[PDB]
Amino acid sequence: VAGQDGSVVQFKIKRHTPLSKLMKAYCERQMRQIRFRFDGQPTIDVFQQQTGGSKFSNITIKNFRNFEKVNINLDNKNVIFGMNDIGKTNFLYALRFLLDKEIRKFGFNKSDYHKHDTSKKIEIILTLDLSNYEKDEDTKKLISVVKGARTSANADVFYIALESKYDDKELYGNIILKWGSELDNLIDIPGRGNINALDNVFKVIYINPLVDLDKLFAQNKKYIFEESQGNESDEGILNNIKSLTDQVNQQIGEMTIIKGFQQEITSEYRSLKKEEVSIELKSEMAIKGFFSDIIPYIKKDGDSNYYPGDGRRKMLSYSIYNYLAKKKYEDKIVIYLIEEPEISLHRSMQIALSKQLFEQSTYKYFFLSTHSPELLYEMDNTRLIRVHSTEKVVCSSHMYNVEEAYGSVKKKLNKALSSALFAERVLLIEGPSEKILFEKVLDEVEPEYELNGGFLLEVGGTYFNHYVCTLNDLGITHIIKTDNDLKSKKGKKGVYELLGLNRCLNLLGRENLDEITIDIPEDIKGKKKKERLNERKKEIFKQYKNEVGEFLGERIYLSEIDLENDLYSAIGESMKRIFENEDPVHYLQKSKLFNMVELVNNLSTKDCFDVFEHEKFACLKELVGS
Amino acid sequence: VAGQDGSVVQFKIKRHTPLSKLMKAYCERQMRQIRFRFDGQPTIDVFQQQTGGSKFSNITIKNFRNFEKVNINLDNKNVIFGMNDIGKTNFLYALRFLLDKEIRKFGFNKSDYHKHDTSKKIEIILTLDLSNYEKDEDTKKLISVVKGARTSANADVFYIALESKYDDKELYGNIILKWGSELDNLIDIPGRGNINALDNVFKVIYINPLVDLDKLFAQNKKYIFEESQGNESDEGILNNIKSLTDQVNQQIGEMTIIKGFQQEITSEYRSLKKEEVSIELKSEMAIKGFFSDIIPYIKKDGDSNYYPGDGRRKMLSYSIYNYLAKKKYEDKIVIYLIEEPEISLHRSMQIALSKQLFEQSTYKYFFLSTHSPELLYEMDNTRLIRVHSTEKVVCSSHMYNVEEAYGSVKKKLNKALSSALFAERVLLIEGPSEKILFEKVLDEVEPEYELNGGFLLEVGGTYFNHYVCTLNDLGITHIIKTDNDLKSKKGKKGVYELLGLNRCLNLLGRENLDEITIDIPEDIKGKKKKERLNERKKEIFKQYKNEVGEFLGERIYLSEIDLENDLYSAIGESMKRIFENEDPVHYLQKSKLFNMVELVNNLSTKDCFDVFEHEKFACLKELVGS
Amino acid sequence: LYALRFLLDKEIRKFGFNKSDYHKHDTSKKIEIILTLDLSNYEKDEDTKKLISVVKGARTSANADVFYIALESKYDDKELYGNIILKWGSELDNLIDIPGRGNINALDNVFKVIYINPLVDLDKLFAQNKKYIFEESQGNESDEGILNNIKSLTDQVNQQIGEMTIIKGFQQEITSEYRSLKKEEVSIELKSEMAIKGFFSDIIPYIKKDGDSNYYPGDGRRKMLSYSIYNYLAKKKYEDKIVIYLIEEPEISLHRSMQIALSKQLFE
Amino acid sequence: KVLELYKPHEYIVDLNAMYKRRKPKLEKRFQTKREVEIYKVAPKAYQSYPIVEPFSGKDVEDLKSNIKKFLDDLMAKINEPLVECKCCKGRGVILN
Amino acid sequence: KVLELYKPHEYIVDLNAMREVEIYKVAPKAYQSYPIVEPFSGKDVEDLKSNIKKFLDDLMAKINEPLVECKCCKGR
Amino acid sequence: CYLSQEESYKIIRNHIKANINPKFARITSDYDFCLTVV
């Protein structure tokens, strides 16, 4: 059972048992208003009646190319990524076939069927939410076209289905669109000729990674000028320009070299064929009008020259999309399919595009397919869809949100997390000192761990809840190596909270443990104070051994004291000789960054393998995947 | 004057003065062996005769498209990046015109001339090094073709020049290739018909991201199987297969339905035209032999099926390139022009390609044009060429090497530095605590600093020499915000080294200061010990105020004590209020990662602007670019 | 010819009308293409029965002899699109829309438009039709045995390829290179494409001169033989629909002797 | 397994044999070394290679003896030389 | 000729335990390196039958004649 | 002691190819993947 807000409730399942009892139990924990669906058919998702949620609920794809049977939850903004490039492309095509008239008119080939098995029926069903009818104008756009296909009982839900059965006689697959509030019976979408009622409400704008700017401006320039009002002064200027262009053509005909050529070429034509015609040389623009060849020119300020750079053309081509998005389609729902925008785009421009997609309101609904972490630097309030590396095409979906608590660290948090999304196994470490040591150890042991899908994500000062929930929902394996930490409360003396233990407990869903008090003498300071805290940490670690056992099952590796002490338990004799200090652990902790680098420099291959094979550093084995 | 090994020497320049005195002075500091070159013509680069270096010294481009006059130093492995996309593409084309026969045969259009000014002539000159004649086999390959174009006086250097003067009469630009050891007089490269002597020695393999695998296997399958020998068993199998395919065609002709059709269609053809012919349906492969249609198949282990995965095919296309590179061309110098490999490539595969380019010896010479930092994760012993964002097309070149000292942290160091290369202003910070604070402050003040070219590069435990030298050589503005640190030597009590001051001094090129001794009582511990060190830090900061003034000129901002104390000066009341503590600085330093996050959460917009406008945090203003 | 394609050809019609398709680019005027048919000789003509069966109730007993197929299109200035709407019926004043589901309509079931252009690749032409030509014919036990025997022969061909030392050496070497690239449990095999897909995938007609052992893929030899395939299909490919041939400029790159031969086919 | 022939073997091959249409052209080669496959083995399922078996021993030293003995005889059957027999011009092999 | 081993029932006993020779090639028409078959010629139909009959026996007695003991190198 | 499936097939093919009588039987398909004697 999966809730709409992300809460997950586990229920025991029997055999030959109605689901009504489970539905009643969930309702009592939290009946007519809620709706229960499983894999897109009425873990099972729930419905929270009237919310501020997206219209798009989920999409089901059956027997379409790779997708044998796939159900993907959706939102207004959706990002699809993963190793399976064909799966990502075909997912976008399934949306185009359902909603784009131009793609749909071509029908389905034999190749478009799963395993080329034309005996199976292609199904693409999109589920929409109409609960927020009164507050959302786009919902009103949809139900105005739909008219009587809905039912008062199911006024909140709506389905748009694409159905296709291959015709072996005609070697053709016909796409038939149906819609309605009840999934069991859907009526055909009415239409006349090539268009249907659905094409009036939905507009799909496919932003291909590479586009010609002047091409894009050519089609839209017609609308841009006709829609605006034309006053009398503009009319006078319009007529004046027509006179100017007419004079240009007249002046061209007055030239001797122009008159000479067109006179003799007329004679040449007349000799060819006794036709009573004349040949004239006129400027094309002066004949069609200034509107025919008007184009935008990127004019740098302080420079009188007009230029047709290249990256600026790509950036400005987006502002045309931005400009049109504001004031072009006010009568239809516009869905943007942006596929691989990062192609031939500088990483600074990728971050600029990321801010447009997520921070701005320009693109209300879009499906973004990307390979670059930079496009996800500003991601927020978006649905992340991950296509697994398997050929079977599994899709894991997570609704990504950043809480108000993380708002101050959102920029740093997003930059780190964006790279981890394109990974199979992610190891969560605290700071750079852990990263320095683990990078050296892995380099000597498993140098190509990054190639295989490993990733070292460092998180500091925040609970692991945000990272783990995102990674777990997306199907990415997460390993956590933290240390038992005691943090002193502000303004209070001799009382510490089990910050290291609490973070791991928060992951398990348990509540935070209470703070404990530590009594130390005033004289006891420095090393004596530190070892006293270490003694309590060892005692606390032993006391909660049951919880620590639970952590190991969830791939959470909690150090007894810290990483340095665990390191000493593996290569302690080696640490003593390279440091030549009385206490290698205490010395390593004095300047964590510089001493770790010095230790890493003097580490040999055998020590790196000793650390890798040690039981305390079992997270490294999990990250590698052995 | 810039040395070959990265050494830089400053000399006074005088008007109306021969360069011989400067050459003599440089030689005495370090004459016939060395060669002096300015902007590709004999800062001043030097040539240290018999050294271990690349064959390619530098390339000069004149009046070619964007390049008005550009001289770029080169190496065996070269990476070109930058915001100017046209500059990067045209640079690769200039190499193709010089070395690729297929591109060169088309000549130069009017557009290929700078500013379309056909009066100016196009010059593309490549300088080569032949000093290591006996060590390098590729040098022998070039010398054998060149023959008498060299001179014993200049046996170490060689030039390959491309000249083109537009023919206004014919509307054509003719490319004429010259070579020789003396730049003033170069003889034309001899050739017969379409090929010339240069095409025998140089092979240019242009790898584009959109390459069809079966297309790639199509051309090379001829060589791969004729080069290898054939024993008796293979010959018997080869003849046996021919018999099998012949029987397949015979069995096809024995079918009733096929025999019926070809009899009917023959009669139809005979009725069309009275010709004594017959039509037979035969398999195309059986006529051409099995060799005509043989293709590679990705076979999953344990799976009998044969599969024609897009990503799998994309990566294996490089395996063919790797396989050919080992044995296809042992008689010519192979140059790989790899343009935007990251296009539609997963980031894990980008790292895999990075390891092949730099760690392996497969691609001895290549020019890589990339937009993704992941392709530079394994970069080492490569030349980095950066095209500036200006339309003027300025190119900055740096020879990237990682020293043996940094070998243990090479993986971590390269990952951080690779993203900084695609930036205009880079601020070097120490750890995540600085990053957390600066990211929050910049978010409230200049939220789009990353879009404009800013970048926060964090470095810890290492000197700034490696990062700054790379960034400075590439023309990227570098700002260093560090703090005054005292590090205790291992095994010695009461003596500290000015680690914070030494790092900044090492950046200036000065020697490290000696370690100083600090006498503290044994009873003085904890906070009392810390404040005593702070007093010494303040005294040391005052003592070396002249050096600190030098640092400010070099955009190096050294804190008097540390970042926390500087932060306290900027916002004292605010920090004291939210930390609810007598000494916020001490509390903030207790748990740097968690307390900074708590401080950042409670910071207001006014406090963030107070930090930004404060004198101590002038690095933020420099990073923003105001 | 395009007006006929827009009316009767599904592939041309699905694209709609541009602004240029309107007379003098005046989109205010309605494009109208009307075809009138005669159904008087219903009892004798089988193709009339083909049309009547699809039409069903759109006819009237008063006008049982005449039938109209109309195409209307009014430009949509809001959407910059010209929608093609097909109507039919016995009465010209009132015509009902041609019923249809999805992309196809009732008219596409009865009318088949074959567009013959002078530049037609023969092997391309044989590519689609070879599927029909062999599936429609009846297959006996002896042919089934030959199918299985051929499949065994092609399988042995692929097996024998893998036994070659130079083939085994390469696919072993490149497997290691691929494994070095990424640690994936994948092996590379060099198999003949035809043997994987079967002989049917690459079978093509070979024009063989009589008394000659060689097999040849002359250009005019192909152009004439491409027409005989059209003749062969015309006899038996479409017995359930009315086939209209739009032959545009057949004389292009055709010898005048072949032009007379084509003339005899069309009229005699 | 590398074995030689006293008399070098004379044979003719075609470098046009991989293709059917073009006319065949004959080229002579002289092979004196004949290679016969004697041992192929893989750690895992790959192609038709027989998967190697894990060494098993009742005791660590017993396992050591099993590994040692298996290597000795396997290596012995490879190192020991074999040459053809002139009494039957290559129909069977014999120790030299 | 299959001189690899004597035929009846050895593969089983070998399981319980745990050079090729070309003798006749022919082709009706020129194909690869196969020798061309000679067309039988006979003055009389019965004369031809005897001629081709004796041709079959001596050729096929050669084919079916047993292997050579191969004293020196024997089976190995 | 159970014999392998592939090894089981191999011995039958090897013996069938060894001592059949061409007077009474013939082998049509003789392949590693399939064997037919008529």
Numbering used by the authors:
A (entry chain C), B (entry chain A): -71 to -42, -38 to -27, -10 to 255, 258 to 575
C (entry chain D): 39 to 255, 258 to 308
D (entry chain I): 198 to 293
E (entry chain M): 198 to 215, 231 to 288
F (entry chain N): 160 to 197
Sentences from the paper on this structure:
Protein interaction analysis showed that Gad1 binds directly to GajAB, and we used cryo-EM to determine a 2.6 Å structure of the GajAB–Gad1 co-complex assembly. The GajAB–Gad1 co-complex structure reveals a mechanism of inhibition in which Gad1 proteins form an oligomeric web that wraps 360° around the host defence complex. Eight copies of phage Gad1 encircle the GajAB assembly, forming a 4:4:8 GajAB–Gad1 complex that is around 775 kDa in size. Gad1 mainly recognizes the GajA nuclease core, forming extensive contacts along the surface of the GajA dimerization domain. Key GajAB–Gad1 contacts include hydrogen-bond interactions from a Gad1 positively charged loop located between β5 and β6 with GajA α2D, and hydrophobic packing interactions between Gad1 Y190 and F192 with GajA α2D. The Gad1 tetrameric interface is formed by hydrogen-bond interactions between the C-terminal ‘shoulder’ domain of each Gad1 monomer and a highly conserved set of three cysteine residues, C282, C284 and C285, which form disulfide interactions at an inter-subunit interface. The N terminus of each Gad1 monomer forms an ‘arm’ domain that extends out from the shoulder and reaches around the GajA nuclease active site to connect to a partnering Gad1 protomer from the opposite side of the complex. Each pair of Gad1 proteins that wrap around and connect at the edge of the GajAB complex are formed by one Gad1 protomer reaching out from the shoulder with an arm domain extended straight down and one Gad1 protomer reaching out with an arm domain bent around 35° to the left. Superposition of the GajAB–Gad1 and GajAB complexes shows that Gad1 binding does not induce a notable conformational change in GajAB, and suggests that Gad1 instead functions through steric hindrance of Gabija anti-phage defence. Notably, the Gad1 arm domain directly occupies this putative DNA-binding surface, supporting a model in which the phage protein directly clashes with the path of target dsDNA.
